[PDB]
Design a protein around this ligand. Sequence first.
Ligand SMILES: [K+]
Ligand SMILES: [K+]
Ligand SMILES: [K+]
Ligand SMILES: [K+]
Lengths: 292, 293, 292, 293
Amino acid sequence: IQRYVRKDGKCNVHHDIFTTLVDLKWRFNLLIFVMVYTVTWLFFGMIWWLIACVTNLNGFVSAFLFSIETETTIGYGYRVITDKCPEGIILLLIQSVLGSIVNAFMVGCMFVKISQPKKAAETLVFSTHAVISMRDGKLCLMFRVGDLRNSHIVEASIRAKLIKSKQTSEGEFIPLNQTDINVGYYTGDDRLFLVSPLIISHEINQQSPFWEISKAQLPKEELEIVVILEGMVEATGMTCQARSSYITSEILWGYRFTPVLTFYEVDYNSFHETYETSTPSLSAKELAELAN
Amino acid sequence: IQRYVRKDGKCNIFTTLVDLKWRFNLLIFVMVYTVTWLFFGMIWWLIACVTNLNGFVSAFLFSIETETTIGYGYRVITDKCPEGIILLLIQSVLGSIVNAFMVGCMFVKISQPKKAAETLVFSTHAVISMRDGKLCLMFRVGDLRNSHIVEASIRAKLIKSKQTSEGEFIPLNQTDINVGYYTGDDRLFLVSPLIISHEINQQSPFWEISKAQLPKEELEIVVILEGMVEATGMTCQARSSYITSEILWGYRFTPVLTLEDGFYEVDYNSFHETYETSTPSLSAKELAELANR
Amino acid sequence: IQRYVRKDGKCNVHHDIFTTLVDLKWRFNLLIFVMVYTVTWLFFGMIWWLIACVTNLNGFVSAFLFSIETETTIGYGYRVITDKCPEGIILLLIQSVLGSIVNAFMVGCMFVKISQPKKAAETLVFSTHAVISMRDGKLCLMFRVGDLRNSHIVEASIRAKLIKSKQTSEGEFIPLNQTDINVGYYTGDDRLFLVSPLIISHEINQQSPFWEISKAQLPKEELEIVVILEGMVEATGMTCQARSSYITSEILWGYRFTPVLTFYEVDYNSFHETYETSTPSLSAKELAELAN
Amino acid sequence: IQRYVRKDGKCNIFTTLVDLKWRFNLLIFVMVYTVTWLFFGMIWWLIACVTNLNGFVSAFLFSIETETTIGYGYRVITDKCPEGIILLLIQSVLGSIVNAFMVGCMFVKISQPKKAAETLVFSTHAVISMRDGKLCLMFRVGDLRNSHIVEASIRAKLIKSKQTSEGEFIPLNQTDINVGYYTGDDRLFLVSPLIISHEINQQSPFWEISKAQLPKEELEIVVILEGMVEATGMTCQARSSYITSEILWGYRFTPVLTLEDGFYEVDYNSFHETYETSTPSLSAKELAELANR
Ligand SMILES: [K+]
Ligand SMILES: [K+]
Ligand SMILES: [K+]
Ligand SMILES: [K+]
C-alpha cells in the first residue's frame, strides 16, 4: 500500500481546449497554431479556386497567397478583387468574419498559455518532515511552508486534509476517508502572510485526529496528511495552488523545526531540517487528563 | 409542478449574445458586420477622395477593405475632399468597437464557469442511510478531469414548502443543508469521487422524515460546486438537483476505489451505482428518541 | 436628519480610467476613442512632415492619410516607404509598436465598458417595506428579494447592515455606527438561490439589535437597515451588487408578506405588498421571558 | 530591522514584465519587435518570391510590413520559390504569439488589484483606547472613490516574536487579529471612512500589553482589504502596516462626518487625525482583573 498524494503534488490515482493547450510544450503548442491557420488558409484558398473577382492568380499556390493576404488583411494589390461575380464578394465577408473568430480563439489560447500561473507555484516549498512536539502546554503537529522567491506570493491560505481508511459502526468501508485538520481556520490564522517561511501549527486537541495517538502508536498508524496551500501572486491577482503530503513515517515525534531566520537574512538550507528536544511521548489526550 | 434545476445543472444586449448558441452567435455577427459595411459603403457613395469606384458594389469592397484594414490599393484615398478623410477615421474607430464586442463575446462565451466544470459530475441519485450511528443523506461528486479545482467547495439547499405555527405558509422555503460548512469539510479536495454527507441532525430539514413519508414528500435538493480552474484565472461551477424520487432510502454508494499496481483505479461505471442495506424505517428524530431512552 | 442609503442604492454622503469610462454615456464614450486616435494620428502625421522615405505626399492632409494607413496597417501603396532616410524607417517601428499599445488600451476599455455587469443589477428588486411579525414561536424582521428576469442571476448572497448613531460608555460619538444583522450567515442560509422572489428573514434574538424594541418603541427609533445583495449572473460568471434601505418608518409591525407564488406563475404585482395578522406588540426580549 | 509592508502597502518571464515600470515595459517591447523583424528580415535575405528588394534595408521594410500586416504592394510576394510562401506563414503565426504577449502584458499590468484600490486609504496611525468597557485597538479605512467595492473585507495580522513554555522561540510569529471575523462585521460596507475595531480580549495578542510596555515592544500589524471593483470583473486590494510607533496609546480618531444640507460631508483632512483621551495605563488583561474583583 503506497501513498495517495506525492511530496511534489501528483496523485497516485487513475481514472476546454485551453486547458489542453496549457499542458502542452511550446514544441507542440506553436504547432497547433500553425496548423489551425494553414488549414483555414487551405480551406479558404480552395474556395477561391472553386470560385474560378480574382486578379493575377495562376495556379494553386496563387490562390493561397491571396487567401492569406485576405484573412491576415495584408492585401498587396497584386491580387485584388473585381465585381464580375457575386460569389467572391460575399466569400470575403464570411472569411473576414471567420478569420476574426479563428484569430480571437488562437490569441485567447496564446494568452491563456502564457498567463498560466503554474510557474509561480514552483517556488512554493513545503518542509520535508512534519513534527509533533510540545508548544505552550499543548502537543502540536507542525510543518513548515514558504516561498523560495521573496518578491511575489506573500498572501496565501493553508488547509490540511487527513486521509485514512475508515469503517463505520454499520460496517461501510471508506477507502480514502478525508477529514479536515485545523491549521487555523476558526481564527483566521490559516490566512497566511509569507514574509518568510512560516511554521504551520495544528493544535492536537479533542477534535484532532491525532488526539489519542502517542509516540508508540504513531508509526503503527496508516495515515496521510494532505497539505493544500494556495496563494495569490504579488504582481498579478492570479492565484495558484501547491500541494505536498506527509505519510505516517514522515512525521517525527519529539522534534522541532530548525529556525531559518537570522537586516533579515533567510537561510534556505535549514528549511527542511529538524531537531528533537525533550518532548512527552504521550497522546495529547492522556497529557490533558493528567494536566487536570 | 416541475423541478428548477435539471440533472445537467441548467435551470428551468451583451448577455443576450453570450447566452445564444454558437450557430446563431456567428450568424448574428455576420449580419452585424454586413450592416456596418452596408451603412459605411452607403456613406462613401454619399461622398460621391475615392479611386476606381464604379457602382454600388465598388463602394462595398472599399468599405470592407477599409474597416477590415485590408486596402488593396486598387481603391485608394485622395485629398480633394474634406469629408472622406474624416469618415475613414469615424469608420476605423467604430470598426474597433464592433470588433471588441465580438472578441468580448468570444472570451466570455468560452470562459463561462458551466463550460469549465463540465468534467465534474454528480451522482444520479441521493441516498439516505446510517453512518456511525447518525442518519445521513449522501450524494457523490467526482472529477473525471486530472486538472484539479482550486478552492473546490460544496453546498446544498432544500426547496420544500412549509408552514409556521402562526399560520404563515412559505410556498418555496429554502433552508441550507449542511454538507460540512461548520468544520471546513465542505471545502473539497476532489480527486477521487467523494461521497458528501449531510448528517441528519436536529438542524436538518430531514430530521422528522421517515421511510413511508419520503415518497409522499415534495421537495428539491439543489447541489452546487464552485472552485477555480487550476490553469485559467476563471471560475468553474457544477450544479445538479435531486428531486424526492432520486433520493433513495436505505441505500449506499458502491465503492469506486481499487488498488492496482502502485496506483489506484477509479471505476466510473460504479460512480452512480447504489446498493441497499439494512437501515431503520424511522426518522432521524425518532431514532434519537429510541436511543435516548 | 435624512437617510444614508436611498431605496435604489445611492449614498447621501459627500466627499483606473476604465472605471471613469464605464460611467460615461456612449455619446461621451465614442468621443474619447475618436479623439485618442486622432491625437495619435495628428502627432505621428506631424512627425512624417518633420521627416520631410515618403511617396506621393503633397500637403498636411497627405501625411495624415499615411500616418493612419500606417498605424491602422492599411497601406494602400499609393504612399509607400523608401530607403533614402534613416529616420523614417525607425519612426514606423515606434509608431507600429505604440499603435499597438494605444489600440490595446482602447479595446481593453471598449470591452470593459460593454462587459460591465451594471445592467444585470437593475432587474434585482427589493421589497418596499420590511415587516416584523411572528414566525415559528419567534419574532422575525422580514423583507423580500428576487430578480425580475427569470433566466439569469439565481445564485446570490444576502447581507444586512444596521446603521445607527452610537455613544460609548466613555462618551465617544459614532455617527453612522453599523452592526451586521444576521440574515442567515452562520447557517449558510444567506447564500440565496433565487428561483423565485424569497423572503429574507432575520430572527430577532438576544444578538439582534431589535431584541428590546417593541411595536411602541419602533417608530420612536432612529435606525436604518442597509441591505446588500450580490449575485452571479447566469450567462456570465460576472457578479454584481444591489442595494436598498429600510428606515424606521419603512418597517411595518404586525405585518406579513403577500405570497407571490401560484406550472409555476410568479405574480410580480404583489411583490412589495404586505398584510397584517394578529402579531404580539412586545419586544422579542419580553416575549422570550414570558415564554420561559 | 525594518518593516515588511510600507504605509503605501508595497512590500520590503511574464510576471517579470508586468512587475516592471511602464517606461521599461515599452522599451523591452520595442526591442522584442525589432529582434523579430531583424530575425525574419534576415530570413528573407537568406531566401534571396520577393519584389523590389535591393539591400538589407529593403528586406526589413518587408519583414515589418508582413508581420504588422501592412503590405504596401511595392514589395509583394511571387510564386517561383517554395521557401518564401511558407516562411510568411511561420512569420504571421509567430507574429500573433508576440502580439498576445504584449496585450497579455497590457491587460495584466493595468488590471492588477493594487492599481484598483489606489483610492482606498488607511489612516496613518493605529490607536489604543477604551470602547464600551473593552480596550480596543482601532485604525481607520476609507474610500475616496464613489465607485464602491463588492465584498469589501478587512483582516489584520500581528508579526511579533514569541517564546513557548517549552523553550521554543518563534522568530516571526503571526497571529491573526480579530477585526470582526466571527460576527461578519469584518465584511465592510465601505462608504464613509470606517473605524475598524479590534476588541483586545483574552484571545488578542495585545491582552497583556500596557502603556509603558507599548513603546518597548517590537511588532508589526499588517492591514489588508480585499473587495471587487463594482465596474470591472477584477479584484482590488489595499495593504498598509502599523509598526509599534504608529500605534498611539490612549488616543481616538477625530470624527469625519457632518450634516450639510440634505447630505453628509466627509472631511478627509480629519481622516488621519487623532485626539488623546483619558484612558487606563494598564493592559486589557489587568483591567479585566480589576473589574473582576
Ligand atoms: K492590415
Ligand atoms: K493591409
Ligand atoms: K496594398
Ligand atoms: K495593403
